[PDB]
């Protein structure tokens, strides 16, 4: 019960910041755990968040730099990326699934179109 | 103040049935949930229903977890802790590797795989609280 | 139309017990069974009792089953499907190898051992349903 | 007298069949029975039966050679704890990635389905059905 | 407990048919899943059948050619072998166990004496 | 919670007998399975023998079967280890432990411990 529209990556130089957004048309958005995945062949989880925002989970390489958050009143999930590094370059995807504790692509059910994020220097 | 053979009704008091009981519809007990990262990236998600806890293992191993080590990021809360130690057998995605995590009455979970620093641990089951 | 402290009786209506209940005899809930070959030779045998499904894994792997692949011969029927993904941990006869099979809410099961084309998978446990 | 009330601590005899939904806000307690024994080769099996489910726990240490696919002949599981269907109880060996299973058939003559083994600490808890 | 006696073995031309029977000496037969095994190498399952006969399972090489069935009123299990191949030459054994979904000799509890089946090319 | 105090350690010559005792400070002793462990290879404490709450079940390391007997007297809150036909391999510090289940064999599977008593064979 979700169609995900992601926005808007871009170019950022090292140490810079970027905020990604992922919105759903449906108010049933609050029934899903959300995850951000990235693909530099194979897509790795970055951060996940439970339905109510009560639980979050991060990859060790992004901890303390990235923050996942959600605004259920706006049917939107965000990824705030601070102190960006060249290894953060990838196409980022938002996904909806039933549990935040899942970390693999096949454990999520609905996907966004993907947004390119490039970090330089 | 009498229980009838029809109608939606609330029944108070300790009721002891000395014979056999059959329930053709659903039988619902109170439920409570909890989830947390035990340690080393491993998440444990629990749902308690009466004297049984349903568990699911999640997350990804993200740091070195020594063999026989305590998982010290989060303990299982007292209301989900067993009376007797339980050994939950899980499997690592993509290969033939199994591990187990013990949950003692203290709730300080312990890892019984070898020393490990990567991989995706999974497994769903139950354990009793007595 | 009143329930008595003796005798065999049938009782309709939603009954809510606010206190503790003890049943000294048996407690029987609705039951239904199913078994089928999920794919690649693997059999899954199920029995639902209330909100729990009892499973046993059987058969013999007899064709190539890719790592992370869908088992497309038979799905778990809707009435046995869980609300969310369950990971059923099993063991291969004759060695130390373990695997798991996921049952998602759709009932299209997935294999989480490595790519395999032989062996005898086994394992008995439970998973929850709504 | 002989009617069940909507208040009070009471005892109710007879087979009671609830055709609708039942909710219990407190605890729901069924009697339990337990058994434990050394199946063979140092392996202990401990069981707790409650209703139609048996909770198992694997204990002890492997202290003699247990052949692959072999019967564990020191103790059989008593009839009251035996399942109708043969069940495969998965366990794990402390300290590594090794899993095994022990079958409990309807006869209660358990069988080891790991490879030939002569050491290690086997553990694992779980459930199997009974009727 | 069951005493099992096989019958029906013998010589058959390639492409021909042969029906094996396994009679049990007790009515407790209906409490057992039955299996047909063959030993040319080790003993391998060929077909299994549940207690009521509602479920069957076959080894890939015999699918569409062999049919396992049972007559609980007669305490007998049958193996109808059609389009026989030299492949099929072995001593065939009937076995009784707890579940049809178990496939190893070790997972069966009672055995017949076996019957020889020979297919010429 | 229990406090355990061992006694009976000492010198014995090969082939001799020695009895160790471990007394719990409270009657709650009968709620616990008891185990005897030793540091024989050393420093790991290896189980020697275990006994269930009521004394109904016992379990022994193979090397001590037919030589050692674990027993308990719940009326005296005490568990005993009777060691007969003592061997040099039995020289060790012995520890009494209390836990919930006799089928456990590892130190971390027990909850309360005695101080350890030295036994010296020859």
GROMACS .gro file of C-alpha atoms in nm, chain A residues 106, chain B residues 93, chain C residues 38-40 42 63-72 85 100-102 104 108-116:
model
   30
  106UNK     CA    1   1.449  -0.876  -0.046
  214UNK     CA    2   2.260  -1.597   0.528
  289UNK     CA    3   0.796  -2.581  -0.201
  290UNK     CA    4   1.052  -2.647  -0.475
  291UNK     CA    5   1.377  -2.821  -0.559
  293UNK     CA    6   1.203  -2.957  -0.039
  314UNK     CA    7   1.777  -2.991  -0.841
  315UNK     CA    8   1.985  -2.674  -0.824
  316UNK     CA    9   1.846  -2.427  -0.567
  317UNK     CA   10   2.021  -2.091  -0.600
  318UNK     CA   11   2.123  -1.894  -0.289
  319UNK     CA   12   1.839  -1.643  -0.193
  320UNK     CA   13   1.603  -1.795  -0.452
  321UNK     CA   14   1.226  -1.825  -0.451
  322UNK     CA   15   1.085  -2.178  -0.416
  323UNK     CA   16   0.818  -2.164  -0.687
  336UNK     CA   17   0.877  -1.268   0.747
  351UNK     CA   18   1.718  -2.137   0.678
  352UNK     CA   19   1.406  -2.092   0.464
  353UNK     CA   20   1.212  -1.767   0.486
  355UNK     CA   21   0.724  -1.407   0.380
  359UNK     CA   22   0.648  -1.763  -0.163
  360UNK     CA   23   0.933  -1.920   0.040
  361UNK     CA   24   1.298  -1.844  -0.015
  362UNK     CA   25   1.614  -2.052   0.030
  363UNK     CA   26   1.895  -1.898   0.240
  364UNK     CA   27   2.155  -2.169   0.233
  365UNK     CA   28   2.420  -2.134  -0.038
  366UNK     CA   29   2.353  -2.263  -0.390
  367UNK     CA   30   2.292  -2.638  -0.341
   0.00000   0.00000   0.00000
